[PDB]
Amino acid sequence: GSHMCDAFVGTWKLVSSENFDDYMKEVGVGFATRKVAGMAKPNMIISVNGDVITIKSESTFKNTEISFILGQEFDEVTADDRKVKSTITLDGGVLVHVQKWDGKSTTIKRKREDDKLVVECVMKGVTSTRVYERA
Ligand SMILES: O=C(N[C@H]1C[C@H](Oc2ccccc2)CC[C@H]1C(=O)O)c1cccc(Cl)c1
Numbered sequence: 456g457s458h459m460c461d462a463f464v465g466t467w468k469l470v471s472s473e474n475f476d477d478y479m480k481e482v483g484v485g486f487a488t489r490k491v492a493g494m495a496k497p498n499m500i501i502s503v504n505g506d507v508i509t510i511k512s513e514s515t516f517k518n519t520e521i522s523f524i525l526g527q528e529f530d531e532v533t534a535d536d537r538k539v540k541s542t543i544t545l546d547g548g549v550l551v552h553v554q555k556w557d558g559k560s561t562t563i564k565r566k567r568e569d570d571k572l573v574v575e576c577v578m579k580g581v582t583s584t585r586v587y588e589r590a
Contacts, residue, residue, distance in 0.1 A: 460503060460545060462567045467499045467587035470571075478576050478583035482561060484535045492516050492534055498590060499572075508543070 456466040472493075479489045497514035511520040517534045523543050531541040531554065539554040550565040561578045 460501065460508065460550070461567065463501045463550065463572065464503055466590040467501070467572050468590040469496050469498070469585060470588050471586040472583065473585075474583040475576075475585065478578055478581050479535070481578035481581045482535070482537075483559075488535050492550065495534075499587060511549065571581060 471579050474492050475536065476489055479492065494495070495514040495516040497512045497516075500511045500513070501508075502509045502511075505523055506524050508525070509520065509522045510531050512518060512534070514534075519532070519534050521529070521531055521541070523541070526544050528540055528542045533539060533554070535556070537556050539556040541552060541554050543550060543552045545551075548566065552563040552565070554561050554563070561576065564575045564577075566573050566575075570588060572587040574587065576583045576585070
């Protein structure tokens, strides 16, 4: 039983980052965490089992893992240790991840573009783009 979200499945390694420090400032991440998180070169491991999608990240900074069903809110601990309420949906082929905490919101979009997985993170008007390639 294939699904469209199978284009995301696999092991991905970070190959470029743009404006991540500024995005983290807008989110409210402190200096020391920004510096060490910004240095990280995570791998992201995406898998699907039935209706459950898992996204795991492994890095020298932190390892994180989320499992979820599309459209069903869950509580998430982020790499920077926010406790957030998250919902992830598929909108036209893009995984759209909204995180809410403390009256604030940020959106992380994940899309396949050529052989890359492109992650766009937006907090108010600030966008960071993080590009992954297959490991
Ligand atoms: O989950 C991680 N990355 C994702 C979600 C991040 O959210 C953050 C917001 C503020 C501070 C840090 C992260 C935004 C960037 C995303 C990406 O895919 O690159 C991740 C996991 C382990 C280590 C590290 Cl450095 C990042």
